[PDB]
Amino acid sequence: GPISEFMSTINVEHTYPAVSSLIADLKSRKVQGPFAVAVETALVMRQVISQTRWSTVDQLIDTVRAVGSTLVKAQPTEFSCGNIIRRILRLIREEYQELLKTADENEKGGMDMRAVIISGIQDVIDELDKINTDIEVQSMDHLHSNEIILTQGCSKTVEAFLRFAAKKRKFSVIVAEGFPNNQKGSHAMAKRLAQAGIDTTVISDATIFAIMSRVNKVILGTHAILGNGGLVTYSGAQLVAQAARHHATPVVVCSGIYKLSPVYPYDLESIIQLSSPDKIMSFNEGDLISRAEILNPYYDYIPPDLVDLFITNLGGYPPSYLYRIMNDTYDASDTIL
Amino acid sequence: TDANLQEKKIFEEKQVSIFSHLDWRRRRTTENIPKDIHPAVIRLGLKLANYKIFGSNQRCIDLLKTFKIVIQDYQTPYGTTLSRHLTTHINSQIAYLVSTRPLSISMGNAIRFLKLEISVLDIDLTDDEGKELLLEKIDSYIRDRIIIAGQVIVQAATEKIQDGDVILTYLHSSTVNDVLIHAKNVGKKFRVVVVDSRPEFEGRVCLKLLTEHGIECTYVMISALSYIMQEVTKIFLGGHAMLSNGALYSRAGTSLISLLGHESNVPVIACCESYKFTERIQLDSLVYNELAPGDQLVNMGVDDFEEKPGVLANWKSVKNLKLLSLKYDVTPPRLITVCVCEMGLLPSTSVPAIINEFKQVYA
Amino acid sequence: GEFDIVQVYKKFLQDDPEITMPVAAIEALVQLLSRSQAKTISEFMDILQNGSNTLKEGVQNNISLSAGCDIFQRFVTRSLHDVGDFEQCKRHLVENGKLFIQRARACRQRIAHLGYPLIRDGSVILTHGFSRGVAAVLLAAAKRHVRFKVFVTESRPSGSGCLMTRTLKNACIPTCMVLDSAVSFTMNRVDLVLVGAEGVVENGGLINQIGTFQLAVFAKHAHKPFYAVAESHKFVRMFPLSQYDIPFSRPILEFDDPSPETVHAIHNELIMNEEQIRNNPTLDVTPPEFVSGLITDLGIIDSKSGVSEELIKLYL
């Protein structure tokens, strides 16, 4: 139930201007990445609650349950958005219920909980600018001296994860430039932690199998996690996964929890987007670009039965325990928007 | 002590040996002991370092009913109240009580629980008030979490035993012994396989116990596993602790037992108690472990160190040659088919939820 | 008075065959509870116990049946309380008892709304014999106009494949029956494997008609996914160790004793007789490692530990 069936575009553009503004920046990739999508999402919803007129909570539920369905229609693949929404919905119904009970002291109006919801929203914001700090701590309970680590594609969360341990313990790391998309960032990361005193070895995205023979652990930072524990990761990460499984090398994932979403991977072909082929073939080979089929996937998928351990802003947990976070973080009704 | 120095060497002990980090340091004597230490702790402390066949579960008990006496004999100074100082007293006990032998998980979790209830009691209650409930809180913690859960497991474990089985244990797990012992009294028809290993043959005492109940048993060392597993039909395992991923944490050969059972299609039943569970998570059996002195390997024959002039007896003074012996390894869940806790037969991977079923009970 | 309640259960089959068996028993229990002039709490539970077992013992000791009935009780007695008005008991019972069966028979629809997107355009599905839920999802998919075509395991000894075949063909979707002996040769051509559920155990296992595990191993080895449709009221407390230890009525897979005497390519009529067919089992069990996804009215469950957490949430 999108918002267009509840409010008109002009009204949406008038009362909730930043929404349509964000919707524009969403489908146009003006905003991008999971983190930047999340923070901007809540900031929008903050103003929404800060500038809305309503009475019942049930009608307030129907509103946010509508913009999200529209907001998620923009660029659904960046699930980071919808995850923030369903969090708010439960954050309302349980805040309502917890306040529906104090009023039932002995009475046997019902709104303007505004600033609390805002104060509840800000609690989500301040929680995000922190996941790295909350995650980079559990490193010292896994990475040890002289260990050998493999990791692909400039995941910021993974960067501060290792750099923390590298402050005190000294060890080695192999970095595979997540070609083609994560090329630039990956080299920077390698250059960065190189200064952090950790043996860094940049490789082609293809020499994965060659070195997996003598690799202790492998570490990955995803783009999103789906209801079955599957991972929607950036380009070219199933190789290292399958390379690890073939070598009995364990697979660990260091990701914030906001990237977790209960959407179920019915059809992956509707998930893995495709970017421009410019990233892999120049415009110049005019003969080729006219004679062949060029494709450049942005994301990669790995199934959960290949992950051995997750690293979250809450703690380390096996994939089979992931669901019990969702029910403790989301509500079942808000699976489909 | 030497303080940061002896606390910097530890973080210098991080080099080539994959065991560079495993803390070898011990205190097997009461020499130079501090005075902040209750006697009954010392006896317990000497028990840990010197007892060998002891303490899959008996430690937590023997630690708690010892702790009562500590607090019982304790009295707060006139200045500060009780809760403002008790922990520091107990903190000075465990520090000693570590250098005798590192903490188990069963002990460590109980300590983590005791320090909590200390911090949550109300100040109105006086000493003789404050003490009396703790013992009950402890005596309950013993009966609720340990003994009862045992009797629940023993019942539930004996349930899935079938007349005609041939079941295999490994190195005297007081829990699994209680199962087979209970199994005989109900009249279940079966027979047991006992796998022992070096060094301190912890398995022969299980043979003694079982035989003193008239049980068809079979004693073979671990290196003969490939042989005897064909006979076996079920495998029972009592663990030191289970892991958040669902991995079973027990003594050295606990993995190979589960392994060949899988490759011989027999089940691996893990009898463990709920409080032994831990939010800890580890992948390789070397990150977190506990060492036994390698000198015990010098014993060539079939007895504890006695008339054993092993050709290794000088390994401490032979370069490039150093013995060792872990006493704990990490067996992954793919081999464990089921864990039986007092919450019932659960899949091993379902552990960390049960832990979360406690932080709800505790605020 | 209320007697031979099986006929109520039975008349439901003539009143409606498109509903399964356990829902009918529930529909009969509430009916039993309805016309139960009781006076004590013990009387109520003593009735349905000595009622359900008589209902249980009457039908093969079927799992799905024994699943719902035992679950039905341990639901009603959950949020049970007695305060002043004793009539509140019978009131709270049937009112909540009606709510259960209401939610119950509606489950088989809720599943379809979740399973239909699991079928892609031009996909190829595989199903072991007839399976209630499997039919509805495919139909509710075909209604939404999606191209695909499925094979069907003939499902010995039940032979339910032909029934499943027609019911699909009757709903204008392509079919192709496959004898249970040659499922493997077909796997490379499939894109998804979907079977029903006749019972679910604690560890995430699967109790379905014999040969269900026969498929999931292929899907595993042939790297094809495996989904099973299960209604909540089919969960059970049973926990089999291996893939064999399950309670079974008759003796199974016994041999003969050949004393020294002398009693004596589409060969379509030399088949095992009814007697020796009986010696075969009717059920196999799929361990959870082969169930990539388990879809229920409670949703889709892949953890196979949340299988148990949701299970514990059922048995009060």
**DSSP labels for A221-250?**
--SEE-TTS-EEEETT-HHHHHHHHHTT--
Burial bucket for residue B236 (CB in 10 Å: 0-12, 13-18, 19+): buried
Tokens found for residue B116: 């909590």
Contact criterion met (CB < 8 Å) for B244 and A317 = yes
- Please answer whether residues C129 and C161 qualify as being in contact, where contact means their C-beta atoms are separated by less than 8 angstroms: yes
Partners for A (CB, 8 Å, 3+ pairs)? B, C
Helix, strand, coil share (%) of chain C residues, nearest 5: 45, 10, 40
d(CA B133, CA B68): 11
**Own/partner long-range contacts of A68-74 (Cβ < 8 Å, ≥24 apart):** A68/A337, A69/A1, A69/A2, A69/A3, A69/A337, A70/A2, A70/A3, A70/A4, A70/A23, A71/A19, A71/A22, A71/A23, A71/A26, A71/A41, A72/A337, A73/A2, A74/A23, A74/A26, A74/A27
Burial bucket for residue C232 (CB in 10 Å: 0-12, 13-18, 19+): buried
Size of interface A-B (CB pairs under 8 A): 48
d(CA A149, CA A167): 16
Show me where the domains of chain B are located: 1-152, 153-363
Instruction: Using the Cα atoms of residue C211, residue C213, residue C216 and residue C218 in order, give the sign of their dihedral.
Output: negative
Task: Assign B329 to helix, strand or coil.
Answer: strand
In C, minimum Cα distance to B261 occurs at: C242
- What distance, in Å, lies between the first and last C-alpha atoms of chain C? 32
Q: Name the residue with tokens 């899988």.
A: B262
Dihedral angle at the C-alpha atoms of C181, C187, C191, C192, nearest 10 degrees? Answer: 40
In A, minimum Cα distance to C290 occurs at: A305
A114-128 and A80-102 helices cross at what angle (nearest 10)? 140
In C, minimum Cα distance to A336 occurs at: C114
The coordinates were experimentally obtained by X-ray
For every residue of B43-107, DSSP letters joined together read: HHHHHHHH--S--SSHHHHHHHHHHHHHHHH----SSS-STTTHHHHHHHHHHHHHHTS---HHH
d(CA A167, CA A198): 9
**Selection from A233, A265, B349 nearest residue C289 by Cα:** B349
Q: Which residue among B338, B344, B349 places its CB closest to the CB of C241?
A: B338
Contact criterion met (CB < 8 Å) for C308 and B350 = yes
Whether CATH 3.40.50.10470 fits C113-314: yes
Distances (CA, A) of B333 to A320, B161, B297: 12, 22, 30
Tokens found for residue C55: 């209902």
Contact criterion met (CB < 8 Å) for A304 and C302 = yes
For every residue of C193-217, DSSP letters joined together read: EEE--SBB-TTS-EEEETTHHHHHH
Q: Name the residue with tokens 């023979």.
A: A213
A11 backbone dihedrals φ, ψ, rounded to 5°? -60, -45
Residues of A in contact with B281 (CB under 8 A): 309, 316-318
Burial bucket for residue C182 (CB in 10 Å: 0-12, 13-18, 19+): exposed
Distances (CA, A) of B154 to B159, B174, B177, B181, B234: 8, 11, 9, 9, 16
Tokens found for residue C168: 């699909």
Distances (CA, A) of B18 to A145, A230, B285, B286, B330: 9, 33, 11, 8, 16
C28 backbone dihedrals φ, ψ, rounded to 5°? -85, -35
Partners for B (CB, 8 Å, 3+ pairs)? A, C
Chain A interface residues (partner C, CB cutoff 8 A):
227-229, 264, 266-267, 269, 304, 319-324, 332, 335
d(CA B186, CA A66): 63
- Please answer whether residues C233 and C19 qualify as being in contact, where contact means their C-beta atoms are separated by less than 8 angstroms: no
Q: Hey, how many other C-beta atoms are within 10 angstroms of the C-beta on C34?
A: 13
Instruction: Using the Cα atoms of residue A79, residue A83, residue A89 and residue A92 in order, give the sign of their dihedral.
Output: negative
Amino acid identity at C264: H
Q: Which residue among C242, C245, C305 places its CB closest to the CB of B347?
A: C305
Task: Assign C39 to helix, strand or coil.
Answer: coil
Chain B interface residues (partner A, CB cutoff 8 A):
11, 14-16, 20-21, 244-246, 279, 281-284, 287, 349-350, 352-353, 356
d(CA A170, CA A194): 11
How close does chain A come to C119, measured CA to CA in Å? 8
For every residue of A164-195, DSSP letters joined together read: HHHTT---EEEEE-BTTTBHHHHHHHHHHHHH
In C, minimum Cα distance to A266 occurs at: C118
How close does chain B come to A208, measured CA to CA in Å? 22
- Residue C254, by phi and psi: left (phi above 0), alpha (psi -120 to 50) or beta? beta
For residue B192, list its beta bridge partners: B167, B217
Distances (CA, A) of A41 to A71, A129, A257, B9: 9, 14, 16, 49
Supply the CATH classification number for the domain C5-112.
Answer: 1.20.120.1070
- What distance, in Å, lies between the first and last C-alpha atoms of chain B? 38
**Selection from C31, C66, C27 nearest residue C49 by Cα:** C66
- Please answer whether residues A187 and A177 qualify as being in contact, where contact means their C-beta atoms are separated by less than 8 angstroms: yes
Residues of A in contact with C118 (CB under 8 A): 266
Contact criterion met (CB < 8 Å) for C120 and A322 = no
- Please answer whether residues C245 and C172 qualify as being in contact, where contact means their C-beta atoms are separated by less than 8 angstroms: no
- Please answer whether residues A318 and A254 qualify as being in contact, where contact means their C-beta atoms are separated by less than 8 angstroms: no
Checking DSSP bridges between strand A231-234 and strand A224-225, what pairing results, if any?
antiparallel
Q: Is the peptide bond before B102 cis (omega within 30 degrees of 0)?
A: no
Chain C interface residues (partner B, CB cutoff 8 A):
202-204, 239, 241-242, 245, 288, 304-305, 308-309
Tokens found for residue B31: 């020499």
Q: Which residue among C120, C301, C306 places its CB closest to the CB of A267?
A: C120
Q: Is the peptide bond before A265 cis (omega within 30 degrees of 0)?
A: no
Checking DSSP bridges between strand C293-296 and strand B241-242, what pairing results, if any?
unpaired
d(CA B82, CA C187): 71
- Please answer whether residues B217 and B295 qualify as being in contact, where contact means their C-beta atoms are separated by less than 8 angstroms: no
Q: Name the residue with tokens 């595979």.
A: A176
d(CA B305, CA C117): 69
Task: Assign A105 to helix, strand or coil.
Answer: coil
How close does chain C come to A64, measured CA to CA in Å? 23
d(CA A311, CA A317): 7
In A, minimum Cα distance to C309 occurs at: A324
How close does chain A come to B352, measured CA to CA in Å? 7
d(CA A315, CA A58): 35
CA angle (C313, C225, C237) in 5-degree steps: 25
CA angle (B158, B161, B167) in 5-degree steps: 105
- Beta-carbon contacts of C189 under 8 Å, excluding residues fewer than 6 positions away, are C124
Burial bucket for residue A164 (CB in 10 Å: 0-12, 13-18, 19+): buried
Cα Rg for chain B, rounded, in angstroms? 22
Half-sphere exposure at residue B47, Cβ-oriented, CA atoms within 13 angstroms? 14
- Please answer whether residues B165 and B193 qualify as being in contact, where contact means their C-beta atoms are separated by less than 8 angstroms: no
- Residue C224, by phi and psi: left (phi above 0), alpha (psi -120 to 50) or beta? beta
Where do the DSSP E strands lie in chain A? 148-152, 172-176, 199-203, 217-220, 224-225, 231-234, 251-254, 299-302, 309-311, 316-317
Residues of C in contact with B265 (CB under 8 A): 242
Chain C interface residues (partner A, CB cutoff 8 A):
117-118, 120, 292-293, 299-306, 309
Task: Assign B150 to helix, strand or coil.
Answer: helix
- What distance, in Å, lies between the first and last C-alpha atoms of chain A? 7
Show me where the domains of chain C are located: 5-112, 113-314
**Selection from A86, A142, A154, A135 nearest residue A256 by Cα:** A135
Q: Is the peptide bond before A180 cis (omega within 30 degrees of 0)?
A: yes
Contact criterion met (CB < 8 Å) for C306 and A267 = no
How close does chain A come to C298, measured CA to CA in Å? 9
d(CA A280, CA A295): 8
Size of interface A-C (CB pairs under 8 A): 32
A17-27 and A34-50 helices cross at what angle (nearest 10)? 160
Resolution in A: 3.5
CA A83 to chain centre: 9
Characterize C97-114 residue by residue with b for buried, 16 or more Cβ atoms within 10 angstroms of its Cβ, and e for exposed. Answer: beebbeebbebbebbbeb
CA angle (B74, B75, B76) in 5-degree steps: 125
Burial bucket for residue A286 (CB in 10 Å: 0-12, 13-18, 19+): exposed
Distances (CA, A) of B144 to A47, A137, B121, B138, B151: 52, 35, 20, 10, 11
d(CA A206, CA A178): 10
**Selection from C218, C191, C175, C222 nearest residue C120 by Cα:** C191
Partners for C (CB, 8 Å, 3+ pairs)? A, B
d(CA A264, CA B295): 56
d(CA B279, CA B352): 6
Residues of A in contact with B245 (CB under 8 A): 308-309, 318
- Please answer whether residues C63 and C52 qualify as being in contact, where contact means their C-beta atoms are separated by less than 8 angstroms: no
d(CA B242, CA B335): 13
- Please answer whether residues A168 and B11 qualify as being in contact, where contact means their C-beta atoms are separated by less than 8 angstroms: yes
Q: What would the 3-class secondary structure string for B198-247 be?
A: CCCCCCHHHHHHHHCCCCCEEEEEHHHHHHHCCCCCEEEEECCEECCCCC
Residue C120 is classified by DSSP as: P
- Please answer whether residues B226 and B257 qualify as being in contact, where contact means their C-beta atoms are separated by less than 8 angstroms: no
Task: Assign B192 to helix, strand or coil.
Answer: strand
**Selection from A21, A18, A41 nearest residue A125 by Cα:** A41
Tokens found for residue A294: 């060029």
Residue in C303, C305, C309, C313 to test binding to A, most A beta-carbons within 10 Å: C303
Burial bucket for residue A90 (CB in 10 Å: 0-12, 13-18, 19+): middle
d(CA C303, CA A268): 20
d(CA B100, CA B288): 18
Tokens found for residue A110: 């019902």
d(CA B130, CA A91): 40
In B, minimum Cα distance to A325 occurs at: B353
- Residue A29, by phi and psi: left (phi above 0), alpha (psi -120 to 50) or beta? left
How close does chain B come to C246, measured CA to CA in Å? 11
- Please answer whether residues C305 and B350 qualify as being in contact, where contact means their C-beta atoms are separated by less than 8 angstroms: yes
A148 backbone dihedrals φ, ψ, rounded to 5°? -120, 120
In C, minimum Cα distance to B160 occurs at: C241
In A, minimum Cα distance to C119 occurs at: A266
- Please answer whether residues A157 and A221 qualify as being in contact, where contact means their C-beta atoms are separated by less than 8 angstroms: yes
- Please answer whether residues A330 and A90 qualify as being in contact, where contact means their C-beta atoms are separated by less than 8 angstroms: yes
In A, minimum Cα distance to B22 occurs at: A144
- Please answer whether residues B248 and B105 qualify as being in contact, where contact means their C-beta atoms are separated by less than 8 angstroms: no
C125 backbone dihedrals φ, ψ, rounded to 5°? -110, 160
Q: Name the residue with tokens 């998620």.
A: A72
CA angle (B140, B244, A81) in 5-degree steps: 120
d(CA C151, CA C128): 9
- Residue A33, by phi and psi: left (phi above 0), alpha (psi -120 to 50) or beta? left
Q: Which residue among A266, A269, A320 places its CB closest to the CB of C118?
A: A266
